[PDB]
């Protein structure tokens, strides 16, 4: 990737960042971002709790579909940050 | 067309400083005459190829010498008694007594006893005969040949890569993380599962039958069906003997934790699972950046738009991409800092969690490896800071970094330097004061008055990790804790016994001596960082010299005007911080060596009692353990440690010779050389033989460099014989 | 020379704590400390210390207590003199304590 | 604009039909990155011809030892007819002397490979070039394309063969055991 | 073996001496006209 | 040889030329300064680099400045 | 036990590496 | 091959002038030494047959030759090795006198220095040298591969 092939994303003067920083998610509405963030956080917390807390994680038997979904907690964080960004962008 | 062809100024230089400066500026390709960026990058690429070839030649040489002259096959049968042999000695200066003394290790010729752990490493990864070592040496030789050919090839016209290709950061980072780290770690996991675990379990898997022999009885059917726990089922038993099928399991990927009981080293199944998992993580990480398809990330965009609100960090990270991708010194500094941190990490982790079989009981190899890697970590950290300073004085553009996160460092450099000075002064004052207080209290026959502070926070961390002797009863030390309950079924059953077992270096017990020495280490680190940070930040300029950037990185001075300007160039801040690097690593290695020597001797009370005062440090560590070294040769005879004694006094001599260059400066020697020039020119006969380069005293920076090199080399060559010879003589 | 004179006869100095020669042991360590301290002045240079003093002067000016008599790094001749004086004091004190402790203990 | 071999992908920018066997087949873009670097495709084309010729020779010499016969057997009676086993069963004399023959051939080739000869044609070592004197340039292109296609086929074939002998121990339509 | 005797002096006395001689002569070579 | 430069902060004090031990510096007429003269270095090849000019310069920072560079017999000041 | 022939072929490979290193050094110098 | 010579010369432009390199003088001198060496190994063969060389299982001692004796090392130096090494030392000393000394008589070594040239190729001694050196490289090749020694190969082949 060359230095020229890069959009101007700097937003220090502005109060909020442009939607270009979201990449492919620039056009995603804020309501969809927020509701998906809530669903993702709930599902990931449920998966981690059922993997480690409710059942103590045994090496012989780990579900895998609970290991997946545990990654949605960072995804939920990103989704709610993007929800805020889209809310301030009015998009 | 003189020797410094790259430097016309040095070519026209008529004195003997031409040779010195050409040699020491040979690799400073950025400042060479008629140099372009593309040629610079291509030459760097070729030099990298040559360097890799040298590394592989060194490895192949070690392997070949152990195969040819080493007792590897004998050592394999009885690792804990046979002393590994490095290589044979050929010396026509040896006497008969020397030949007899150096004849050891169950061989008929003089030899050197290896202290690098290569025997343990090769035995663990599954080398059993000299033939395997020889074939590995041949493979490494062929690899070095290929790398040298590649280095030659990529300087050719049609094969010279371009500047855009060199500056393609995204593709390089993607591949050097998904392939160089990820796929290579996956390959190592495959090697373990295919060759190392079977060899530790008593199976001879080599190239002629690794295709036929299955790593697991089930094969890849569990892997493709998703029943991956079958590979963890049936682990190795606690009665297993390394290298024999008795007590051997069938698991290839486990998370037992702890240590293998016979070897007191980590399980090879655990290591294979580690490398497999981390390879998966690296391969996932290496798809982050955008390369030719659309998916990915743009590092320029990420850095540009990472700026916090209301200008907290100024304009944020704008322009950092440009400065980093344009300046090679910043990249070099970041790489050196990361590698120094990694070297410190491996030094701290090898002794705490030994991975190679029977290395825990090999006390000489452990101390040698720890000292080695700690010293290299210090060197790499000093280099990282030095190249950061060079970047500031050579490659920093304030126009690009207009109100940048990097420019604000220069903005509040005065505050940074003043606070580093404060913390250094506080730590030094109070650590030295407590040490002297303890010294005087013990000296006046009243040790009860010592100010002994228990390292409560470190002990709390040990308890949280699983230690129980302190009685804190927190987290993993508490049986009821949710953390213990969660981890109870995977690794804690092994980890708890490993940490609580007292025969191991995992989370050593600590006390007031540990408190005091840790605060001394903090003092030394903060002072070294103070010197290096001040050099880097004042490299551009100062109140005594605002135009330092015009003069550059390494210049002698600005003259005696303005009160004197000695050691102002910020190369002199490398020079001055190298002393503190040697000091801090020396303190760290003294601490490690003494605390481990006492524990190996089962006499930890000696450290716990005498380490609280400097007289105890001088008496019970240096004076006590220096006897087997200095007695390597005496009036009555000589032992195998005579070489180590000679070297201790040789390192002493080099260290003392450095003081000459560091104390006496150039004018005295220039006048003396003028007198010698007069004498040579005026004597008869000898005046027919006449120099070509006018002899002159060494330059100021040249002599600072030479004195520092003498200091450092004497330091290492007088500490290495001590740490090896004393440990060998005591065998504890 | 290193083994049978320095190492051998340093026993009476290092083993002096808790006795009448504990003062000689303390002076031994202090003389070693001063000898090491002297190397700072002997190896270092005035420009570094002047820049460091500039940073510290900024720190004091921030709190409005920078002195009217502006602080300066020592002159070059003075730095050499201070290093030499500390070097000689440390060395002579080390030998003084060592000889006195050894001879008082054995003779 | 579109590749002639893969009609739903863009044409490789480097390839432009000025080479033998050019059908725009470069999904990864080796030619593209080489042209960005600055080098030419002469090295890759000559390496392709080398590999294709070697693969053709290897394929014929691997179907032969057990087809028309393992020589009159002066010394090859002990060498196994299995090709993957014969390589670890050649004697020292024959092995080293085949080695030195191919070494001198490759060392002779290396100079014109990495040289700066402007008149050098890729795949023109002068060995057996006399037949090309009679033929015309269109015929020359056709014959070079036939050579390239045969080598391209053999590179993949052989590869199969080797694997079939390794894992099954026999080819399907020939070499019954 | 005899390789140590054959090679150690060859590579530690003869070769480094020739290298020092060559380097000295090369650095003392003057500019071409 | 070293590079001697004079910046327009000069005030024609002629003390650099007095401190000069090699006749590298001289006063030449000028408009900017009230004294009507400015230091100049027409013989930089004779410079040795002791920076007595810089020591004697009374400006807040040095109007006369010497940058060390290529070494020669004259710059090294070798009598042999 | 490493054989004399084994040491000799390893030495030959080392000499090849030496020649390539000399070539690489020359190309780096130019 | 002249192209390879120009490539070398070009690369190494210094060694070239003295004749060190792929030069006819160098080829001639080796050839002379290789012919003398065929004569030498034949002389040692007949000397060993006639038990000329003090020989056997006798070995040197540290008290007679010191650290060069290598007594106590794995290497077992023989008196035949010592005497043949002394003969070779005498040969080397005479050669060094002939080379670095006056060109008393005969032929130079360093291309007669003096900016002389290399006369590209009785004058058949260069052909004989080709013969002798190819024979020598063949002898090392068999000694390395077949492992059948040197004197034994010479004796059975002759
Ligand atoms: C409080 C701190 C903070 C804040 C406010 C922001 C804010 C922002 N970041 Mg982020 N970022 C942060 C910390 C922060 N970052 C850190 C610590 C990192 C380093 C890891 C990054 C790395 C990063 C990148 C690489 C990028 C951003 C970008 C962004 C923008 C998009 C946010 C978004 O929804 O993406 C997140 C959206 C998601 C749907 C979630 C992503 C996936 C999750 C986190 C992980 C999933 C698992 C993983 C892939 C696999 C397992 C291994 C926004 C301006 C974008 C930009 O333009 O930057 C200027 C962008 O490309 N950030
Ligand atoms: C904290 C770290 C971090 C952050 C902040 C981001 C942030 C971002 N990444 Mg990600 N990324 C990360 C780590 C991170 N990444 C890592 C470790 C990797 C390596 C595996 C990647 C690999 C990666 C790629 C290859 C791409 C991104 C992209 C993105 C953007 C996604 C926008 C989005 O969700 O739109 C809303 C989402 C959609 C419209 C698609 C949703 C489809 C399903 C729901 C995805 C579910 C995935 C989940 C992990 C499970 C966003 C700026 C994309 C981009 O355009 O970047 C500029 C992109 O192509 N990232
Ligand atoms: C291909 C690589 C690989 C293989 C063969 C194994 C094999 C094994 N692991 Mg696993 N493991 C891996 C990678 C791998 N691991 C990675 C990357 C991690 C994260 C660091 C772990 C962490 C881990 C732990 C902590 C434990 C195991 C254990 C096990 C055993 C049973 C697992 C099981 O039944 O899962 C069956 C699951 C599936 C068939 C589906 C998995 C699909 C995943 C979730 C897809 C997404 C991956 C994700 C993006 C990668 C990043 C990691 C993220 C979760 C943070 C078995 C020996 C257990 C063991 O041996 O205990 C003694 C155990 O306790 N593993
Ligand atoms: C990845 C590692 C790495 C790399 C690639 C470089 C590369 C470079 N460093 Mg070095 N450097 C490193 C690590 C590294 N450094 C470390 C660890 C330190 C800390 C000690 C330093 C400290 C350092 C300083 C202080 C300076 C450099 C400089 C340089 C540049 C010129 C050096 C030269 O020509 O010397 C050629 C020297 C020799 C060929 C002989 C030196 C003799 C030594 C004493 C003994 C060698 C024994 C073998 C060069 C770009 C110089 C620079 O950039 O100046 C503007 C410079 O001043 N480096
Ligand atoms: C007169 C003093 C003297 C001398 C001349 C030597 C000579 C030697 N010793 Mg030493 N040795 C001595 C005293 C001496 N020793 C003493 C008192 C002892 C104690 C008993 C030993 C113990 C000893 C051991 C145990 C060994 C040697 C070895 C060697 C040999 C090194 C072989 C080689 O190629 O190294 C190469 C040398 C170097 C790489 C170092 C030079 C580094 C340069 C300067 C770096 C910079 C590049 C340069 C400018 C170009 C050599 C014959 C080794 C041996 O036998 O090897 C086969 C060996 O293992 N010696
Ligand atoms: C044992 C020798 C020694 C000692 C004690 C020091 C002490 C110091 N060095 Mg170091 N230094 C040394 C050797 C030493 N250096 C050497 C050999 C070099 C290489 C040239 C350097 C190079 C160097 C640099 C370049 C720098 C330091 C800095 C410092 C300070 C570190 C913080 C500290 O400990 O403050 C606490 C002070 C002490 C422990 C000693 C104070 C005096 C004691 C306690 C006596 C108290 C007064 C007494 C009652 C008076 C009685 C008079 C009759 C301090 C002034 C750095 C710093 O922070 O500067 C501000 C700094 O910039 N040093
Ligand atoms: C043009 C090349 C070529 C040809 C003509 C064949 C032909 C054949 N292969 Mg294949 N094969 C090839 C390349 C080729 N292979 C390659 C490149 C590989 C390695 C990836 C394989 C690996 C392979 C295996 C492992 C097997 C075959 C087998 C077969 C047979 C049945 C498969 C089919 O439908 O056809 C058939 C004789 C099967 C066979 O021959 O069974 C005896 C069989 O088991 N092939
Ligand atoms: C939904 C999940 C992800 C969708 C794919 C994203 C994408 O296609 O890239 C978006 C960009 C194009 O938009 C690009 O949008 C970008 C705008 S900007 O530069 O970032 O401001 C820019 O690259 C350009 O304008 C435009 O081409 O590139 C592509 O669309 C082609 C890439 C798709 C094929 C490569 C990988 C295939 C998908 C990967 C697997 C996804 C994991 C599940
Ligand atoms: C002195 C001298 O000689 O001068 C030379 C000079 C010069 C110019 C070089 C000359 C020439 C021409 C030469 C050298 C010609 C050589 C030609 C040669 C040797 C050409 C082989 C092709 C093989 C192919 C395509 C194989 C396909 C193979 C395939 C596709 C398969 O069979 C596939 C398959 O096998 C698998 C994979 C698995 C099996 O289950 C199934 C089968 C069996 C189906 C001259 C003029 O003649 C003479
Ligand atoms: C393949 C190829 C090329 C090539 C080639 C070829 C075929 C090269 C062949 C080279 C060849 C065949 C080179 C042999 C040298 C032998 C010598 C010098 C032996 C001297 C040995 C001597 C002088 C020994 C003397 C003694 O020891 C003896 C015997 C007895 C002892 O008492 C002691 C003495 C000292 C008396 C090109 C054309 C170059 C281009 C490109 O590279 C590709
Ligand atoms: C001058 C300069 C430079 C340099 C610099 C340097 C040299 C630096 C270094 C630095 C460093 C060297 C740093 C480090 C750091 C570290 C850190 C920051 C860490 C962290 C950690 C963490 C976070 C952890 C955590 C955890 C975990 C994870 C687990 C367990 C627990 C705990 C808590 C421990 C450069 C080149 C850039 C350029 C510019 C200038």
Short mmCIF file of N, CA and C in Angstrom, two decimals, chain H residues 51-100:
data_model
loop_
_atom_site.label_atom_id
_atom_site.label_comp_id
_atom_site.label_asym_id
_atom_site.label_seq_id
_atom_site.Cartn_x
_atom_site.Cartn_y
_atom_site.Cartn_z
N UNK H 51 62.13 -49.40 2.97
CA UNK H 51 62.27 -49.05 4.36
C UNK H 51 63.37 -48.05 4.41
N UNK H 52 63.15 -46.95 3.73
CA UNK H 52 64.14 -45.93 3.72
C UNK H 52 63.75 -45.01 4.81
N UNK H 53 62.46 -44.71 4.93
CA UNK H 53 62.05 -43.70 5.92
C UNK H 53 61.98 -44.29 7.32
N UNK H 54 62.80 -43.76 8.25
CA UNK H 54 62.71 -44.24 9.62
C UNK H 54 61.23 -44.38 9.86
N UNK H 55 60.75 -45.58 10.15
CA UNK H 55 59.30 -45.76 10.24
C UNK H 55 58.84 -46.88 11.13
N UNK H 56 57.53 -46.98 11.33
CA UNK H 56 56.96 -47.97 12.22
C UNK H 56 55.91 -47.35 13.12
N UNK H 57 55.75 -47.95 14.30
CA UNK H 57 54.88 -47.41 15.34
C UNK H 57 55.61 -46.48 16.29
N UNK H 58 56.86 -46.14 16.00
CA UNK H 58 57.60 -45.19 16.82
C UNK H 58 56.99 -43.80 16.69
N UNK H 59 56.93 -43.07 17.80
CA UNK H 59 56.28 -41.77 17.85
C UNK H 59 57.16 -40.80 18.62
N UNK H 60 56.97 -39.51 18.32
CA UNK H 60 57.74 -38.48 18.99
C UNK H 60 57.30 -38.36 20.45
N UNK H 61 58.04 -37.54 21.19
CA UNK H 61 57.79 -37.32 22.60
C UNK H 61 57.87 -35.83 22.89
N UNK H 62 57.19 -35.41 23.96
CA UNK H 62 57.19 -34.00 24.34
C UNK H 62 58.59 -33.53 24.72
N UNK H 63 59.42 -34.43 25.24
CA UNK H 63 60.76 -34.06 25.68
C UNK H 63 61.71 -33.78 24.53
N UNK H 64 61.37 -34.20 23.30
CA UNK H 64 62.23 -34.02 22.14
C UNK H 64 61.76 -32.90 21.21
N UNK H 65 60.44 -32.70 21.08
CA UNK H 65 59.89 -31.68 20.20
C UNK H 65 58.81 -30.83 20.86
N UNK H 66 58.50 -31.05 22.13
CA UNK H 66 57.64 -30.13 22.85
C UNK H 66 56.21 -30.20 22.37
N UNK H 67 55.53 -29.04 22.40
CA UNK H 67 54.12 -28.99 22.06
C UNK H 67 53.82 -29.38 20.63
N UNK H 68 54.80 -29.24 19.73
CA UNK H 68 54.60 -29.71 18.36
C UNK H 68 54.58 -31.23 18.28
N UNK H 69 55.16 -31.92 19.27
CA UNK H 69 55.05 -33.37 19.32
C UNK H 69 53.61 -33.82 19.52
N UNK H 70 52.80 -33.00 20.19
CA UNK H 70 51.40 -33.33 20.46
C UNK H 70 51.26 -34.59 21.29
N UNK H 71 52.24 -34.87 22.15
CA UNK H 71 52.14 -36.02 23.03
C UNK H 71 51.08 -35.78 24.08
N UNK H 72 50.16 -36.74 24.23
CA UNK H 72 49.00 -36.61 25.08
C UNK H 72 47.73 -36.26 24.31
N UNK H 73 47.87 -35.75 23.09
CA UNK H 73 46.73 -35.53 22.22
C UNK H 73 46.34 -36.84 21.54
N UNK H 74 45.17 -36.82 20.89
CA UNK H 74 44.75 -37.99 20.13
C UNK H 74 45.67 -38.26 18.94
N UNK H 75 46.19 -37.20 18.32
CA UNK H 75 47.09 -37.37 17.19
C UNK H 75 48.36 -38.08 17.64
N UNK H 76 48.81 -39.03 16.81
CA UNK H 76 50.00 -39.85 17.08
C UNK H 76 50.99 -39.61 15.94
N UNK H 77 51.88 -38.63 16.14
CA UNK H 77 52.86 -38.28 15.11
C UNK H 77 53.99 -39.30 15.12
N UNK H 78 54.42 -39.70 13.93
CA UNK H 78 55.47 -40.70 13.75
C UNK H 78 56.77 -40.05 13.30
N UNK H 79 57.88 -40.75 13.56
CA UNK H 79 59.19 -40.25 13.16
C UNK H 79 59.31 -40.17 11.64
N UNK H 80 58.61 -41.04 10.91
CA UNK H 80 58.58 -40.91 9.46
C UNK H 80 57.91 -39.60 9.06
N UNK H 81 56.82 -39.24 9.75
CA UNK H 81 56.18 -37.96 9.50
C UNK H 81 57.14 -36.82 9.80
N UNK H 82 57.88 -36.93 10.90
CA UNK H 82 58.82 -35.88 11.28
C UNK H 82 59.91 -35.70 10.23
N UNK H 83 60.49 -36.81 9.75
CA UNK H 83 61.61 -36.68 8.82
C UNK H 83 61.12 -36.19 7.46
N UNK H 84 59.95 -36.65 7.01
CA UNK H 84 59.43 -36.16 5.73
C UNK H 84 59.07 -34.68 5.86
N UNK H 85 58.57 -34.27 7.02
CA UNK H 85 58.28 -32.86 7.24
C UNK H 85 59.56 -32.03 7.24
N UNK H 86 60.65 -32.57 7.79
CA UNK H 86 61.93 -31.87 7.73
C UNK H 86 62.39 -31.72 6.29
N UNK H 87 62.24 -32.78 5.49
CA UNK H 87 62.60 -32.69 4.08
C UNK H 87 61.78 -31.62 3.37
N UNK H 88 60.48 -31.57 3.65
CA UNK H 88 59.64 -30.55 3.05
C UNK H 88 59.99 -29.16 3.54
N UNK H 89 60.44 -29.03 4.79
CA UNK H 89 60.89 -27.73 5.29
C UNK H 89 62.12 -27.27 4.53
N UNK H 90 63.05 -28.19 4.27
CA UNK H 90 64.22 -27.84 3.47
C UNK H 90 63.81 -27.41 2.07
N UNK H 91 62.87 -28.14 1.47
CA UNK H 91 62.36 -27.77 0.16
C UNK H 91 61.74 -26.38 0.18
N UNK H 92 60.94 -26.10 1.21
CA UNK H 92 60.30 -24.79 1.32
C UNK H 92 61.32 -23.68 1.51
N UNK H 93 62.36 -23.93 2.30
CA UNK H 93 63.38 -22.91 2.53
C UNK H 93 64.14 -22.60 1.24
N UNK H 94 64.53 -23.64 0.51
CA UNK H 94 65.22 -23.42 -0.76
C UNK H 94 64.31 -22.69 -1.73
N UNK H 95 63.03 -23.07 -1.76
CA UNK H 95 62.07 -22.41 -2.63
C UNK H 95 61.90 -20.94 -2.27
N UNK H 96 61.81 -20.65 -0.98
CA UNK H 96 61.65 -19.27 -0.53
C UNK H 96 62.86 -18.44 -0.90
N UNK H 97 64.06 -19.02 -0.77
CA UNK H 97 65.27 -18.33 -1.21
C UNK H 97 65.23 -18.08 -2.71
N UNK H 98 64.75 -19.05 -3.49
CA UNK H 98 64.69 -18.87 -4.93
C UNK H 98 63.64 -17.85 -5.34
N UNK H 99 62.56 -17.73 -4.57
CA UNK H 99 61.44 -16.86 -4.93
C UNK H 99 61.69 -15.42 -4.49
N UNK H 100 61.86 -15.20 -3.18
CA UNK H 100 62.09 -13.86 -2.68
C UNK H 100 63.52 -13.38 -2.88
#
